[PDB]
Amino acid sequence: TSLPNYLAGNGDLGSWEPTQIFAGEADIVTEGGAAGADIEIYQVIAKNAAGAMVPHDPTATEVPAPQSVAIGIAAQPAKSGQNVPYYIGGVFNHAALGWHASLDTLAKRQAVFDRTNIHIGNLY
Amino acid sequence: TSLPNYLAGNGDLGSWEPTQIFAGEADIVTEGGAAGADIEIYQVIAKNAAGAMVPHDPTATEVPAPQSVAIGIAAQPAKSGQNVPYYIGGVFNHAALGWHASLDTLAKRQAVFDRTNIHIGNLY
Amino acid sequence: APFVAPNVQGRVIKESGYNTKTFKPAYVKPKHVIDPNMIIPRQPGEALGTGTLSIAQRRDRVIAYLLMKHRAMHENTWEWMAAQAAQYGYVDVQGQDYPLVRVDFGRDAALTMTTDWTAAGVTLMDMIADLRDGQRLVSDKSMSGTVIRDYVFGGDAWDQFVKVGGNVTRLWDDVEGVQYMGELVGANGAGRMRIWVNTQKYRDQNDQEQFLMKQKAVMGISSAIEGVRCFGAILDKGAGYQALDYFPKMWDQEDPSVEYLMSQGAPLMVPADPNASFLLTVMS
Amino acid sequence: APFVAPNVQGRVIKESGYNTKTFKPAYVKPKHVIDPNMIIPRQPGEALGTG
Amino acid sequence: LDKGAGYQALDYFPKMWDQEDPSVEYLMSQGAPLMVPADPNASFLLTVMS
Amino acid sequence: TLSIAQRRDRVIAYLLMKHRAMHENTWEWMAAQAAQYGYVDVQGQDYPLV
């Protein structure tokens, strides 16, 4: 901090990429509900038995839990106890969304959202 | 680094300090010499038996080693085998130099350099 | 400045450094949808049952009322951020669609005190000594070291204060909520102690009405805090993405004709010298 | 560019990013001293005897 | 097949619109190409390697 | 140095140039395909193979 450098060297300031999110022209619907666990940016969210916003994870039970359905897509990160403004409508990217394991291929990532306003298609 | 922060928040950017070196108006004498150990910035150097530039440290051996007599203040950092440009003239700040342990007070630091062109004085 | 003899050279003086703190504004979007169910029924600026005014002109009346109302709410949020930055040194921007982040301004933690005025034997000199100790720790930590001229009390803080004991100020005479009680001379010596009492009540984001001033505590703050109000970029097709105070906007859907009406601004209240205040809690 | 049937809406194409590089200049100080020991003695284009 | 330029045959046709909330601005071009040799038999193709 | 609106103007000019060049690339791809094989196979996710 205190001393400047007089010598000769080099460095990279860094790099920047765009992260495209939208893929179509649906209407966009948003809502903020209170979260139950930590949610990253653009992570698929479910709702647990207490009405919170647990990030989506299937194979959660001999009857599956209501976390097994997926509802929203987050927009800003929040810990437990904070509320999360998420998406309910629109058309979103295949790759920019934070999924998790065992949900990797294309067909499962649309069979999650066959029914809603949300539709997940590939960028060209 | 792809997504901007849409939220609010704070960010600490840093704290600069001036590092004044000089305390007088004497002339300045500089010389380059090859280093033997790693030398920091504004560190007190000596010369070992090989004629290299070892940083200063008393209590060295029954016989006072030539490292125990300090010579000059370094100016630019270097590794071993590189050469160091170091001040041999002028009147210097007290606490902006590289002094090691058991050489803390003002009186011992001037007792290092009572005789040379280099003088060590306080700032105000 | 240092004395030397006029024979010797002179003494060299050190300098001091900086600090930089950076901030970002928070973003605000209120809106009203305008149905047919609001342009048709009567309003007070009407001719009482005879349609001398068109329902187009009644639409114009209710639109002008809504624009004045969004101006009102943006000014209320400016006031609330101002009070948060004056008291806590941090503002807790929550919201229904906005996660809790905590814009901290770098208040020294020793300024935010916690004492007690409920125990037996507390005198008038003890409370004034507590305020004077707060003034001490403000005048130490501050950059310019400015003495505090103001002490803003809550409601119950003023009650516990008086129950134990026994022009610029003329701009606040007609105004509800904030009343200048009076400059107490006392035995401070370092500062004069003006007293304000703040009892405004703003509606919260859950519409559970709360006090703008923390009522069980004492804030004391000089005018040398010298904050600057901040306004970020308005991310919108209208005005071309620029920075303004706030920005109303209107569009509509074709079938049915439901006009929308949205204002959006990006306020932030930043003190440019945060160590010029303290928050003294006196109660539980 | 992608083929799209005239009924349906269309496809979205991604884009690319940047990269940077920084550098610093290096510093050069040669010098000369000049004495009476260097000015006084003779230069070659000078007649013999009297300089 | 688009209302801009009134359904007229063109090379490519740019087109821009948006949505009012949030400020997202779609941008689309449309074309209808086909490359036809009128005499198809005027060009052969010889594969020479494996 | 650039305003946020001027950033949008730059990226719109770039995307218009990129659309023009993509339609030109599809023209030359059809031309090359028809010159080589005498038949073009149109494909894509939004279009049946013909």
Coordinates of C-alpha atoms in Angstrom, one line a residue, chain C residues 79-268:
Chain C
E79 CA -35.9 10.1 5.5
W80 CA -35.7 6.5 6.7
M81 CA -32.2 5.9 5.2
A82 CA -31.1 9.2 6.7
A83 CA -32.3 8.1 10.2
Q84 CA -30.6 4.7 9.9
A85 CA -27.3 6.2 8.8
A86 CA -27.5 8.7 11.6
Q87 CA -28.2 6.2 14.4
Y88 CA -26.6 2.9 13.7
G89 CA -23.8 3.5 11.3
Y90 CA -25.2 0.6 9.2
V91 CA -28.5 0.5 7.3
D92 CA -30.4 -2.8 7.1
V93 CA -32.0 -2.8 3.6
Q94 CA -34.5 -5.6 3.8
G95 CA -37.5 -6.0 1.6
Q96 CA -40.1 -8.4 0.1
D97 CA -38.0 -8.7 -3.0
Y98 CA -34.6 -7.7 -1.7
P99 CA -32.2 -9.8 0.5
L100 CA -30.9 -8.4 3.7
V101 CA -27.6 -6.7 3.1
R102 CA -25.9 -4.4 5.6
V103 CA -24.2 -1.3 4.2
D104 CA -21.8 -0.4 7.0
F105 CA -20.2 3.0 7.1
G106 CA -17.3 2.3 9.5
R107 CA -18.7 3.6 12.7
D108 CA -16.2 3.0 15.6
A109 CA -17.8 0.2 17.7
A110 CA -16.9 2.0 21.0
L111 CA -19.3 4.8 20.1
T112 CA -22.3 2.5 20.3
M113 CA -22.7 2.4 24.0
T114 CA -25.0 0.6 26.5
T115 CA -25.7 2.1 29.9
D116 CA -28.6 1.9 32.3
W117 CA -30.6 4.7 33.9
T118 CA -33.0 2.5 35.8
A119 CA -31.0 1.5 38.9
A120 CA -31.4 3.4 42.2
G121 CA -29.2 6.3 42.9
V122 CA -28.7 7.6 39.4
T123 CA -28.5 11.4 39.6
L124 CA -28.8 14.2 37.0
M125 CA -25.0 14.5 37.1
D126 CA -24.6 10.8 36.2
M127 CA -26.7 11.1 33.0
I128 CA -25.0 14.3 31.9
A129 CA -21.6 12.6 32.7
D130 CA -22.6 9.7 30.5
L131 CA -23.5 12.1 27.6
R132 CA -20.2 13.9 28.2
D133 CA -18.3 10.6 28.0
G134 CA -20.0 10.0 24.7
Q135 CA -18.9 13.4 23.6
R136 CA -15.4 12.5 24.7
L137 CA -15.3 9.4 22.5
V138 CA -16.8 11.3 19.6
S139 CA -14.2 14.1 19.8
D140 CA -11.4 11.6 20.0
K141 CA -12.3 9.3 17.1
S142 CA -13.4 12.0 14.6
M143 CA -11.3 13.3 11.8
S144 CA -11.9 16.9 12.6
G145 CA -12.7 16.3 16.3
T146 CA -15.8 18.4 16.2
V147 CA -17.7 18.9 19.4
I148 CA -21.4 17.8 19.3
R149 CA -24.1 20.4 19.7
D150 CA -27.2 18.1 19.5
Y151 CA -28.8 15.3 21.5
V152 CA -31.8 13.6 20.0
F153 CA -33.8 11.7 22.5
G154 CA -36.6 9.1 22.0
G155 CA -39.9 9.2 23.8
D156 CA -39.1 6.8 26.7
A157 CA -35.5 8.1 26.9
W158 CA -36.9 11.6 27.6
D159 CA -39.4 10.1 30.1
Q160 CA -36.6 8.2 32.0
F161 CA -34.5 11.4 31.8
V162 CA -37.1 13.7 33.3
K163 CA -38.5 11.2 35.8
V164 CA -35.1 10.8 37.4
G165 CA -34.3 14.5 37.4
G166 CA -36.2 17.5 38.6
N167 CA -33.6 30.9 13.4
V168 CA -32.6 27.3 12.8
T169 CA -34.5 26.0 15.8
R170 CA -37.5 28.1 14.6
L171 CA -37.9 26.1 11.4
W172 CA -39.5 23.3 13.4
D173 CA -42.3 25.0 15.3
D174 CA -45.3 24.1 13.2
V175 CA -43.9 20.6 12.6
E176 CA -45.3 17.4 14.1
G177 CA -43.1 15.0 15.9
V178 CA -39.8 16.9 16.3
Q179 CA -39.8 19.5 19.1
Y180 CA -36.9 21.5 20.5
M181 CA -37.2 21.1 24.2
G182 CA -34.4 23.5 25.2
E183 CA -30.6 24.1 25.5
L184 CA -29.5 22.9 28.9
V185 CA -26.3 24.5 30.2
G186 CA -25.5 22.1 33.0
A187 CA -21.9 21.2 33.9
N188 CA -20.7 19.9 30.6
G189 CA -18.0 22.5 29.8
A190 CA -16.9 21.0 26.5
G191 CA -20.2 21.2 24.7
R192 CA -23.6 22.9 24.9
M193 CA -26.4 20.4 25.1
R194 CA -29.4 21.2 22.9
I195 CA -32.2 18.7 23.3
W196 CA -34.5 17.4 20.6
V197 CA -37.3 14.9 21.0
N198 CA -38.1 12.8 18.0
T199 CA -41.4 10.8 18.0
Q200 CA -42.2 10.2 14.3
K201 CA -43.8 6.9 13.4
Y202 CA -43.4 5.6 9.9
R203 CA -45.2 2.6 8.5
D204 CA -42.9 -0.4 8.2
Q205 CA -42.7 -2.8 5.2
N206 CA -45.0 -5.1 7.1
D207 CA -47.3 -2.1 7.8
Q208 CA -46.6 -2.5 11.5
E209 CA -46.0 1.1 12.5
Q210 CA -42.6 1.7 14.1
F211 CA -40.7 4.7 15.4
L212 CA -38.2 6.5 13.2
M213 CA -36.1 7.1 16.3
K214 CA -35.0 4.3 18.6
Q215 CA -37.1 5.3 21.6
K216 CA -35.1 3.7 24.4
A217 CA -31.9 5.3 23.4
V218 CA -30.0 8.6 22.9
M219 CA -28.4 9.7 19.6
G220 CA -26.1 12.8 19.7
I221 CA -24.9 14.1 16.4
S222 CA -23.2 17.3 15.3
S223 CA -23.8 18.9 11.9
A224 CA -20.1 18.1 10.9
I225 CA -21.1 14.6 9.8
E226 CA -21.6 16.3 6.4
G227 CA -23.1 13.4 4.5
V228 CA -23.9 13.4 0.8
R229 CA -27.1 11.8 -0.6
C230 CA -26.4 9.3 -3.4
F231 CA -28.5 8.3 -6.4
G232 CA -27.5 5.5 -8.7
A233 CA -28.4 4.6 -12.3
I234 CA -32.1 4.1 -13.2
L235 CA -32.0 0.9 -15.2
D236 CA -34.8 1.8 -17.7
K237 CA -35.6 2.5 -21.3
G238 CA -36.9 5.8 -20.2
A239 CA -34.3 8.6 -19.6
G240 CA -31.6 6.4 -21.2
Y241 CA -30.2 4.4 -18.2
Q242 CA -29.0 7.6 -16.4
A243 CA -29.0 8.7 -12.8
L244 CA -31.9 10.8 -11.5
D245 CA -33.8 11.5 -8.3
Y246 CA -36.6 9.1 -9.2
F247 CA -38.3 8.2 -12.4
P248 CA -42.0 7.6 -13.1
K249 CA -43.0 5.4 -16.0
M250 CA -46.3 4.5 -17.6
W251 CA -47.3 1.8 -20.1
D252 CA -50.3 -0.4 -20.7
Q253 CA -51.7 -3.8 -21.9
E254 CA -54.0 -3.8 -24.8
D255 CA -56.8 -6.2 -23.8
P256 CA -58.1 -5.4 -21.2
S257 CA -57.0 -1.8 -21.0
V258 CA -55.0 -1.9 -17.7
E259 CA -52.5 1.0 -17.6
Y260 CA -49.5 0.4 -15.4
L261 CA -47.6 3.1 -13.5
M262 CA -44.2 2.6 -11.9
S263 CA -41.7 4.9 -10.3
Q264 CA -38.1 3.8 -9.7
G265 CA -35.2 5.4 -7.9
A266 CA -31.9 4.3 -6.4
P267 CA -31.4 6.2 -3.1
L268 CA -28.6 5.9 -0.7

